[PDB]
Ligand binder design. Structure first.
Ligand SMILES: CCCCCCCCC/C=C/C(=O)SCCNC(=O)CCNC(=O)[C@H](O)C(C)(C)COP(=O)(O)OP(=O)(O)OC[C@H]1O[C@@H](n2cnc3c(N)ncnc32)[C@H](O)[C@@H]1OP(=O)(O)O
Length: 266
């Protein structure tokens, strides 16, 4: 019943802080399939799941998706090596809490997140088809090496306005070990990959490594492994890039909405 990324938790009686430790290894589940410059790196989406799982393990709430991520900061890349120990802390209350994700070196901080009670979903184009193989080739040429578990874009198009629209699926090798996820990281990453097909992205490659450094307004309305369509838009913000992605199910219901994904260009 133990979450494979968050691990097992205790509350420190001397300060009220909840603390978890998990043992990570490159052979754990699908982690080996997320590679940057030949090194196994923990994907940004995994930190989002860890923060949501931490809140869910701390507070009793009788809702399937009680939380949103107000802000998540990705401060330092994590190289997943044998014997890695991920240390998560949570402070706060059932309305708003602060999560910090570290590795045992002392400790190094990899991500911080503010988690809050979910805001409900409110009710208030000509295309050019693209080849998904070309997207993954562009990403690999930039040093972003998604293995089979992450190769979930199976159809792709871009609108005249430069918005990317993808048909998505969760590869079988990403499905084991997922029962405990609030937000399936591989699925969230697949949704983000759509940003690589926007006009802004292809103009930049027409390369440099583009990595997420901040998420704001991550909304989860259901089980995102039911997602079949992702729509992503990307704009320049000075030397950075800012995107927005929506993942919907086969009946058009939004499952995941990321209001801002801020990326650095290396
Ligand atoms: C093309 C389309 C493709 C689209 C295709 C997309 C498909 C999905 C691809 C997914 C890829 C990944 O998931 S990659 C894995 C997830 N991403 C990551 O791990 C990125 C982790 N972050 C980083 O490595 C770093 O931020 C890095 C980018 C190298 C910049 O590092 P530096 O510290 O050296 O530079 P910084 O100044 O710190 O970075 C920005 C700010 O970070 C913070 N920082 C420093 N100390 C801080 C502090 N004490 N408290 C808060 N923040 C602090 C401050 O906010 C900084 O300003 P100051 O306060 O003054 O310091």
């Amino acid at each position: 019943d133990t979450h494979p990324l968050l691990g097992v938790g205790v509350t420190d009686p001397t300060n009220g802080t909840r603390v978890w430790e998990s043992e990570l290894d490159p052979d754990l589940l699908w982690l080996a399939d997320f590679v940057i410059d030949d090194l196994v790196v923990l994907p940004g989406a995994a930190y989002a799941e860890i923060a949501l799982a931490a809140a869910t393990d701390t507070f009793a709430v009788e809702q399937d998706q009680p939380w949103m991520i107000s802000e998540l900061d990705l401060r330092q890349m994590l190289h997943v090596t044998p014997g890695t120990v991920l240390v998560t802390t949570l402070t706060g209350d059932e309305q708003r809490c602060q999560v910090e994700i570290r590795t045992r070196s002392g400790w190094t901080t990899h991500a911080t997140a503010t988690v809050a009670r979910a805001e409900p979903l409110a009710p208030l184009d000509l295309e050019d088809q693209l080849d998904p193989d070309d997207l993954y080739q562009r990403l690999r040429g930039a040093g972003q090496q998604h293995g089979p578990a992450f190769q979930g874009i199976v159809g792709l198009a871009v609108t005249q306005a430069g918005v990317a629209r993808a048909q998505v699926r969760l590869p079988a090798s990403a499905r084991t070990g997922s029962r405990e996820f609030m937000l399936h990281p591989v699925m969230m990453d697949i949704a983000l990959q759509t940003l690589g097909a926007t006009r802004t992205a292809t103009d930049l490659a027409g390369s440099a490594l583009v990595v997420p450094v901040r998420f704001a307004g991550v909304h989860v309305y259901g089980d995102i492994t039911r997602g079949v369509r992702a729509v992503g838009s990307l704009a320049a913000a000075g030397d950075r890039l800012v995107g927005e992605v929506v993942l919907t199910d086969a009946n058009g219901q939004p499952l995941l909405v990321v209001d801002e994904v801020e990326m650095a260009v290396l």
